[PDB]
Amino acid sequence: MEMRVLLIAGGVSPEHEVSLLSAEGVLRHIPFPTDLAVIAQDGRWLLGEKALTALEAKAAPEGEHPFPPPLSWERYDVVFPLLHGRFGEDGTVQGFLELLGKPYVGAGVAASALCMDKDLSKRVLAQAGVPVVPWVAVRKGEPPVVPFDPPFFVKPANTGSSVGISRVERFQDLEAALALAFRYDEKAVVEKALSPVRELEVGVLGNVFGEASPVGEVRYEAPFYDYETKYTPGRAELLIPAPLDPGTQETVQELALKAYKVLGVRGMARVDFFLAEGELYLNELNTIPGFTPTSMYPRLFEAGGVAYPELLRRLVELALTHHHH
């Protein structure tokens, strides 16, 4: 069976650089012939050799081709969008690939848009009976109304890689944290800070009915799991399988697969959890998790017997299983 993959990375979101790092990880292990297309930070695309040059520079601030690119789509059998964050993970790029008729890796338009919004996903999961941290949404320009005591975490609703996230100890500091969050999104979420908190992560592989990886725990000495901790090698420790009680591992996997099914995710997702005072909370689902050298999604399925090339092979294959339907 003929298979040629087009890999798209970069993007206009703050995670532009993280996306190129993920692209390098995928290219080093994907078992299919794969071409790279880069979306530069200005929204213009780089194709062919100019895309590989931008990958070597680990940043593409400016691109060549305005959207839509003159890409020979017919040459590829599956498109692998690796665009973390806004305009890549939130269903907008997915909508373009749907109208293009090309099979593509990962969640569709709906699952991507709803998993990217920290307020909407928490609305759906809370109704479904999934435990979530207390939270409220704040629209840019509206006065916040936080019906619980600090500490808070303030986040852009569409964020990734902990960009624009603040831990707020005093109400005096809510205004500055919201102003930081509103640089990246018109909507912010304010969550009750769990402290102390343990952070659990589990990978999911599959279309709607997912297969769960072992549960992993992230540990670090920074105040929280911030940008520098996430992508500086050595700062983040992954303990697989997570040191959890008899049965706690299964509950984490059951919640992840439940949220996966309810939201209708296809392909993959990394589901993050909080463990505080013995209580589990689902933090978020990431439909396009990182494949950077310090990323956890490949390591989680590595520990579950799915090697890195086999994981990428199954992702491309799941894209065709849905498209062939």
Ligand X SMILES: Nc1ncnc2c1ncn2[C@@H]1O[C@H](COP(=O)(O)OP(=O)(O)OP(=O)(O)O)[C@@H](O)[C@H]1O
Interface with a second copy, residue 116, by CB under 8 A = yes
Q: 60 or 296: whose CB is closer to Cs ion?
A: 296
Ligand-binding annotation for 176, yes or no, is: yes
Answer for which of 52, 64, 65, 109 binds a second copy (CB under 8 A) is 109
Answer with the entry of Cs ion, ligand X, a second copy, none that 162 interacts with (C-beta below 5 to 8 A by kind). Answer: ligand X
Cβ pair 111, 288 in contact under 8 A: no
Q: Annotated catalytic sites, by residue?
A: 15, 161, 231, 270, 272, 284, 286, 290
Interface with a second copy, residue 101, by CB under 8 A = yes
User: Looking at beta carbons, which pairs linking 218-224 to residues 24 or more positions away fall under 8 Å?
Assistant: 218/296, 223/167, 224/153, 224/162, 224/165, 224/167
Answer with the entry of ligand X, Cs ion, Mg ion, none that 194 interacts with (C-beta below 5 to 8 A by kind). Answer: ligand X
Ligand-binding annotation for 263, yes or no, is: no
Closest-by-Cβ residue to ligand X is 225
144 burial via Cβ count (<10 Å: 0-12, 13-18, 19+): middle
Q: 93 or 271: whose CB is closer to a second copy?
A: 93
Order of strands, sheet of 152-156, starting from the edge strand that comes earlier in the sequence: 135-139, 187-192, 152-156, 166-168
Residues in region 120-159 near a second copy by CB under 8 A: 120, 123-124, 126-128, 139
Interface with a second copy, residue 254, by CB under 8 A = no
Min CB(314)–ligand X separation in Å: 22
Min CB(212)–a second copy separation in Å: 18
Q: 44 or 167: whose CB is closer to ligand X?
A: 167
Min CB(283)–Cs ion separation in Å: 9
Q: 76 or 225: whose CB is closer to Mg ion?
A: 225
Q: What track of x and - describes contact with ligand X for positions 268 through 307 (by CB under 6 A)?
A: ----x-x--------xx-x---------------------
Distance (Å, rounded) from C-alpha 130 to C-alpha 72?
43
Q: 226 or 317: whose CB is closer to ligand X?
A: 226
Binding site for a second copy (CB under 8 A): 43, 67-68, 87, 90-96, 98-101, 109-110, 113-114, 116-117, 120, 123-124, 126-128, 139, 186-187, 208, 261-264, 325
Binding site for ligand X (CB under 6 A): 133, 153, 155, 159-162, 165, 191-194, 197, 199, 224-225, 272, 274, 283-284, 286
- Which residues are documented as binding site for Mg(2+)? 272, 284, 286
- Which residues are documented as binding site for ATP? 149-200
